Design an enzyme around this catalytic site. Structure first.
Site, PDB file in Angstrom:
ATOM      1  N   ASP A   1       0.809  -1.224   0.000  1.00  0.00           N
ATOM      2  CA  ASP A   1       0.000   0.000   0.000  1.00  0.00           C
ATOM      3  C   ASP A   1       0.839   1.269   0.000  1.00  0.00           C
ATOM      4  O   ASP A   1       0.279   2.362   0.019  1.00  0.00           O
ATOM      5  CB  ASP A   1      -0.966   0.035   1.175  1.00  0.00           C
ATOM      6  CG  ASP A   1      -0.412  -0.090   2.567  1.00  0.00           C
ATOM      7  OD1 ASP A   1       0.812   0.003   2.768  1.00  0.00           O
ATOM      8  OD2 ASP A   1      -1.203  -0.243   3.526  1.00  0.00           O
TER       9      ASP A   1
ATOM     10  N   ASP B   1       0.548 -11.044   6.092  1.00  0.00           N
ATOM     11  CA  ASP B   1       0.252 -10.282   4.885  1.00  0.00           C
ATOM     12  C   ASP B   1       1.620  -9.983   4.265  1.00  0.00           C
ATOM     13  O   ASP B   1       2.369  -9.137   4.754  1.00  0.00           O
ATOM     14  CB  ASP B   1      -0.462  -8.992   5.290  1.00  0.00           C
ATOM     15  CG  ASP B   1      -1.332  -8.390   4.204  1.00  0.00           C
ATOM     16  OD1 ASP B   1      -1.359  -8.958   3.107  1.00  0.00           O
ATOM     17  OD2 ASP B   1      -1.978  -7.365   4.476  1.00  0.00           O
TER      18      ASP B   1
HETATM   19  O1  LIG Z   1      -6.859  -7.444   4.244  1.00  0.00           O
HETATM   20  C1  LIG Z   1      -5.697  -8.192   4.040  1.00  0.00           C
HETATM   21  C2  LIG Z   1      -5.068  -7.914   2.697  1.00  0.00           C
HETATM   22  O2  LIG Z   1      -6.002  -8.397   1.693  1.00  0.00           O
HETATM   23  C3  LIG Z   1      -5.379  -8.364   0.399  1.00  0.00           C
HETATM   24  O3  LIG Z   1      -6.353  -8.893  -0.459  1.00  0.00           O
HETATM   25  C4  LIG Z   1      -6.674 -10.301  -0.359  1.00  0.00           C
HETATM   26  C5  LIG Z   1      -8.193 -10.360  -0.102  1.00  0.00           C
HETATM   27  O4  LIG Z   1      -8.486  -9.960   1.208  1.00  0.00           O
HETATM   28  C6  LIG Z   1      -8.611 -11.834  -0.201  1.00  0.00           C
HETATM   29  O5  LIG Z   1     -10.039 -11.885  -0.169  1.00  0.00           O
HETATM   30  C7  LIG Z   1      -8.182 -12.306  -1.590  1.00  0.00           C
HETATM   31  O6  LIG Z   1      -8.670 -13.583  -1.691  1.00  0.00           O
HETATM   32  O7  LIG Z   1      -6.745 -12.335  -1.612  1.00  0.00           O
HETATM   33  C8  LIG Z   1      -6.227 -10.965  -1.605  1.00  0.00           C
HETATM   34  C9  LIG Z   1      -4.751 -11.098  -1.798  1.00  0.00           C
HETATM   35  O8  LIG Z   1      -4.157 -11.703  -0.683  1.00  0.00           O
HETATM   36  C10 LIG Z   1      -5.065  -6.942  -0.026  1.00  0.00           C
HETATM   37  O9  LIG Z   1      -4.377  -7.065  -1.274  1.00  0.00           O
HETATM   38  C11 LIG Z   1      -4.196  -6.263   1.022  1.00  0.00           C
HETATM   39  O10 LIG Z   1      -4.067  -4.881   0.784  1.00  0.00           O
HETATM   40  C12 LIG Z   1      -4.829  -6.454   2.428  1.00  0.00           C
HETATM   41  O11 LIG Z   1      -3.915  -5.937   3.417  1.00  0.00           O
END
Ligand SMILES: OC[C@H]1O[C@@H](O[C@H]2[C@H](O)[C@@H](O)[C@H](O)O[C@@H]2CO)[C@H](O)[C@@H](O)[C@@H]1O
EC number: 3.2.1.4
Length: 213
Positions: A10, A121
């Site tokens: 981010d 993460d």
């Molecule tokens: O909130 C944690 C993290 O999520 C990231 O996106 C995920 C999403 O939550 C999940 O539903 C999807 O299946 O996978 C993505 C990728 O891991 C998001 O990219 C991050 O910014 C956030 O911190």
């Protein structure tokens, strides 16, 4: 113990980049818009209006060989708190997906919010900005969806040069694994990781060391 992973990038100042978060020599470095380290640990996060401190580009993952990688993560670990995980290192052994069996040693540089779970993460440019987009104000923004980021390796070619290497790692070493699970243990931080954040815990010597191939 076992845990769950996600991916993100981010561009915000990491939560272990503030003083007095944990028993460390110094907080994790933050960087200016051109990715140069800043030496004022009280600088305002670039994810807040008028802020100037962003994530540093050298806090990205890299492969040492086909079975072992190094990198960084935002963490939430059951049974502990931010003073217990900031700047600690963990050895992950993936147990699902295309990377099952591979190992990666990470340093925790920020905090997530998944109560009762062991959530890592992983820092990966192009992994998704999530709620706060610090990348737009920093350099004009990154491509991809908010959650999950880009889709294919060729999308890494349009990134700013300092973030390209971490972007490619997702498709090369990591094989585009989608939120693989893992088993993990806390370990003494490798010098290679501490060299990129500047942050070493005072209790680092109470854990086993890992041998980088
Ligand atoms: O909130 C944690 C993290 O999520 C990231 O996106 C995920 C999403 O939550 C999940 O539903 C999807 O299946 O996978 C993505 C990728 O891991 C998001 O990219 C991050 O910014 C956030 O911190």
């Amino acid at each position: 113990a076992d845990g769950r992973s996600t991916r993100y990038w981010d561009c915000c100042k990491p939560s272990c980049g503030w003083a007095k978060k944990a028993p460390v020599n110094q907080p994790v470095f933050s960087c200016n818009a051109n990715f140069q380290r800043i030496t004022d640990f009280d600088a305002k996060s670039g994810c807040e209006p008028g802020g100037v401190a962003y994530s540093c580009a050298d806090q990205t993952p890299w492969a040492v060989n086909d079975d072992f990688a190094l990198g960084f993560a935002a963490t939430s670990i059951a049974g502990s708190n931010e003073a217990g995980w900031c700047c600690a290192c963990y050895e992950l052994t993936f147990t699902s997906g295309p990377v099952a069996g591979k190992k990666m040693v990470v340093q925790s540089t920020s905090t997530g919010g998944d109560l009762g779970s062991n959530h890592f993460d992983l820092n990966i440019p192009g992994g998704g900005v999530g709620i706060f987009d610090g990348c737009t104000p920093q350099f004009g923004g990154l491509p991809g969806q908010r959650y999950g980021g880009i889709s294919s390796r060729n999308e890494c070619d349009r990134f700013p040069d300092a973030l390209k290497p971490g972007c490619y790692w997702r498709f090369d070493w990591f094989k585009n694994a989608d939120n693989p699970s893992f088993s993990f243990r806390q370990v003494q931080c490798p010098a290679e990781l501490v060299a990129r954040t500047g942050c070493r815990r005072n209790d680092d010597g109470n854990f086993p060391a890992v041998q980088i191939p």
